């Protein structure tokens, strides 16, 4: 009851205040008992949602950052009928560096909506991307495995790609949401847009996220909450905190 009333109140006050009308998303701030150990990288681990999808590749503007040669990647992904309508722009890292600087970089930040990187250039990304993209967790770049291949030691790796695999990756990465590992007990997760769904969808999303986060199995990606969850607050980018589950 309290949570639902809080959502009604935040939606009403969001309609009232002007800057509240200007920001359009919903996050929950969860505070645990103990501190997390994993020092904060910028690899957004995604959390599986089981009931309601949140966004579509048919909705988000997408940039894909491939390796250096880029030729077979771009021609296959543009040509083979499953990803032609998918990626707004394919670009290489050398092209990105040799093409964008400063005001052009902020033009990219205000233009694109979702960027995905080859996982072996995801580490190299942040200098070329700029100090603007790494602000919080709104436009944090994701990693997608390009070719469904594996590299063994002292063994040459074959370069490939397959559009069904990258399409399934993107559809999962748009159906569900993500989080970031921290060192304080106060972490966040963006859950849902303010209009693309309603209060039962939001509450169900909250329950599935807290369940996956407290789940002990899948500990590489799910077993990260240390101790009992103290409380869960809800907010948008410009509101205050609203409390849920104080103990």
């Amino acid at each position: 009851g309290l949570a639902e009333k809080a959502l009604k109140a935040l939606i009403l006050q969001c309609e009232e205040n002007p800057s509240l009308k200007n920001d359009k998303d919903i996050h929950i701030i969860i505070n645990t008992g103990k501190k997390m150990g994993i020092n904060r990288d910028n690899i957004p681990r995604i959390i599986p949602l089981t009931k309601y999808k949140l966004f579509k590749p048919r909705d988000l503007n997408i940039l894909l950052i491939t390796k250096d040669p880029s030729a077979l990647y771009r021609e296959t992904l543009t040509k083979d009928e499953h990803t032609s309508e998918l990626f707004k722009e394919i670009i290489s890292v050398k092209n990105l560096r040799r093409r964008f600087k400063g005001s052009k970089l902020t033009q990219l930040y205000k233009d694109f909506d979702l960027v995905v990187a080859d996982y072996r250039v995801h580490h190299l990304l942040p200098e070329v991307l700029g100090s603007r993209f790494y602000h919080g967790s709104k436009k944090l770049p994701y990693m997608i495995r390009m070719s469904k291949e594996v590299k063994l030691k002292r063994q040459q790796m074959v370069e490939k790609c397959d559009p069904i695999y990258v399409r399934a990756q993107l559809r999962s990465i748009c159906k569900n949401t993500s989080y970031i590992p921290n060192n304080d007990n106060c972490l966040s997760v963006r859950v849902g847009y303010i209009q693309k769904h309603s209060i039962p969808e939001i509450l169900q999303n909250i329950q599935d996220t807290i369940n996956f986060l407290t789940d002990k199995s899948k500990r590489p990606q799910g077993g990260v909450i240390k101790g009992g969850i103290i409380s869960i607050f809800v907010k948008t980018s410009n509101s205050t905190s609203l409390p849920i589950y104080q103990f």
Partner: peptide, 17 residues
């Protein structure tokens, strides 16, 4: 009449400290 209430609660917490 809940958002103003929780804002007042935060303010009372701070001024009580």
């Amino acid at each position: 009449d809940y958002y103003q209430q929780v804002q007042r609660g935060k303010q009372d917490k701070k001024i009580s400290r």
